[PDB]
């Protein structure tokens, strides 16, 4: 029975923590989950297995098979990564800290291309297949996987963009800039539709929006900042918002929904040290997930109540919530041990 941290009348558990008789009652879930002293970015594929965790020094790819509970390989890529996506299964696209883009396959490293300026984010379009890559400046580029061309790059404002995302059920391209404007483009028209401005009441310094998200209803939009302040948005009276100051507030990097499992209207926010979870329409914290080290980013596995972080320590932490949901079919005795 794994120990649980104190919270607001709710329980969470960590597996593979910094502390995790213990040697002979080990509770290790995924073997060889440890990197070279940090972690870049972890995400779980669309199907029921094959999670991918990017590397730290001699950076790797680290695909874990969930139905084998261990590592498959580690393709030591050429440069250090910041952002990537997964395109179903075996294909995936990455971009590194330099302005280069790798295409991993089953054989690995299908191509290495580049963008003219230093990039910061990448997303893929399921409809007509053009990956949009956000970079520094006036420049939000396309690499269409149909015919391998380049497209007429989207003209931005001065400094650039920290995050780009497209909406799923209808395709509304977000681009979180530096000057508080969110710069919604249309993936149909290749033109702007709106230049929504973000406001507060504290106004410490001119914050920059760093996280953008949507969900599968296509009506709301989750917004971030460089200050530790979550925001919600709708088309219904789109000028105000609801806001969420966080108790430490450095830079929120991961805001993701719970739009496919039970216990609805709930959202996860995540800044550099803490990751919390709260409810819509009130703004009150359901739980929080305080680790012993900082967080590079997180992810949430679909269908069930578990979370996978990428942090600055040697292992990665997984966080199980036995009130948000169960443990999945490949982890189907976590509810028997704890």
């Amino acid at each position: 029975v794994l120990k649980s941290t104190s919270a607001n009348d709710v329980s969470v558990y960590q597996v593979s923590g910094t502390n995790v008789l213990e040697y002979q009652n080990r509770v290790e879930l995924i073997q060889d989950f440890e990197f070279s002293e940090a972690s870049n970015k972890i995400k779980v594929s669309r199907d029921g297995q094959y999670c991918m965790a990017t590397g730290t020094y001699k950076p790797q790819i680290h695909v874990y098979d969930f139905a084998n509970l261990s590592l498959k390989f580690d393709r030591h890529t050429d440069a250090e990564n910041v952002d990537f996506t997964i395109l179903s299964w075996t294909k995936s696209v990455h971009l590194q800290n330099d302005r280069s883009i790798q295409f991993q396959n089953k054989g690995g490293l299908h191509y290495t291309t580049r963008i003219p300026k230093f990039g910061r984010s990448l997303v893929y379009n399921k409809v007509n297949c053009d990956l949009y890559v956000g970079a520094s400046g006036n420049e939000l580029y396309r690499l269409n996987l149909e015919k391998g061309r380049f497209l007429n790059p989207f003209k931005l404002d001065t400094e650039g963009v920290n995050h780009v995302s497209i909406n799923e059920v209808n395709g509304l391209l977000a681009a979180g800039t530096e000057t508080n404007v969110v710069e919604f483009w249309d993936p149909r028209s290749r033109s702007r539709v709106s230049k929504l401005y973000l406001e507060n009441n504290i106004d410490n310094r001119p914050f920059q929006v760093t996280t953008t998200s949507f969900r599968n209803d296509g009506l709301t939009f989750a917004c971030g900042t460089s200050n530790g302040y979550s925001y919600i948005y709708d088309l219904r009276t789109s000028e105000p918002s609801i806001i969420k100051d966080q108790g430490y507030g450095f830079d929120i990097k991961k805001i993701i929904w719970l739009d496919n499992v039970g216990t609805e209207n709930k959202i996860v926010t995540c800044d550099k040290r803490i990751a919390k979870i709260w409810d819509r329409l009130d703004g009150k914290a359901y739980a929080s997930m305080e680790p012993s080290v900082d967080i590079n980013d997180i992810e949430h596995v679909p269908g069930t109540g578990m979370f996978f972080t990428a942090n600055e320590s040697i292992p990665m932490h997984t966080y199980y919530i036995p009130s948000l949901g169960p443990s999945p079919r490949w982890c189907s005795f976590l509810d028997s041990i704890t």
């Binding site: 002293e37 940090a38 020094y57 800290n97 080290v293 900082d294 600055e312």
Partner: protein, 166 residues
């Protein structure tokens, strides 16, 4: 990294038809470890016999040197504002050689009050940081090769030499 050879590229004459060779062991380009701020973790890599190389990634305890007396004392790291060997490197806030990074200068306050008595001859635009706490200082040591963060403080001429820039 990849390589160190002229065979993949053109010389001062403009030649072609390269198709040369499988690349050897001694063209070894390791990955660029952009050293950042964190908890102190140095990877001990091997090369050329027992030539251990300290590859620092998350170093903090910078030994930065008081210039006019040469007093290399221990402090922390804040962030680099200007380094146009890559203008995105200061956007991402890494820590490489010859960068100008900010330091909470509290042990330099301790040394001044310890070997001079009073608190505050030294320049005014660094006396402002003597009062406030954060002074500018440039890294000398190589954390990607020697694994260390040493540096020198900014005192007057070199201060304005960077402040007029950015």
């Amino acid at each position: 990294g990849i390589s160190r050879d002229s065979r993949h590229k053109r010389s001062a004459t403009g030649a072609k038809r390269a198709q040369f060779r499988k690349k050897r062991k001694f063209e070894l380009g390791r990955q660029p470890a952009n050293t950042k701020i964190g908890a102190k973790r140095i990877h001990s890599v091997r090369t050329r016999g027992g030539n251990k190389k300290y590859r620092a990634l998350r170093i903090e305890t910078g030994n930065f040197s008081w210039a006019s007396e040469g007093i290399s004392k221990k402090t922390r790291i804040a962030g680099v504002v200007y380094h146009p060997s890559n203008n995105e490197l200061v956007r991402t806030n890494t820590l490489t050689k010859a960068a100008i990074v900010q330091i909470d200068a509290t042990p330099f306050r301790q040394w001044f009050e310890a070997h001079y008595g009073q608190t505050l001859k030294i320049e005014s635009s660094v006396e402002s940081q003597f009062s406030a706490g954060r002074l500018y200082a440039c890294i000398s040591s190589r954390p990607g090769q020697s694994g260390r963060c040493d540096g020198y403080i900014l005192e007057g001429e070199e201060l304005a030499f960077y402040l007029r820039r950015l």
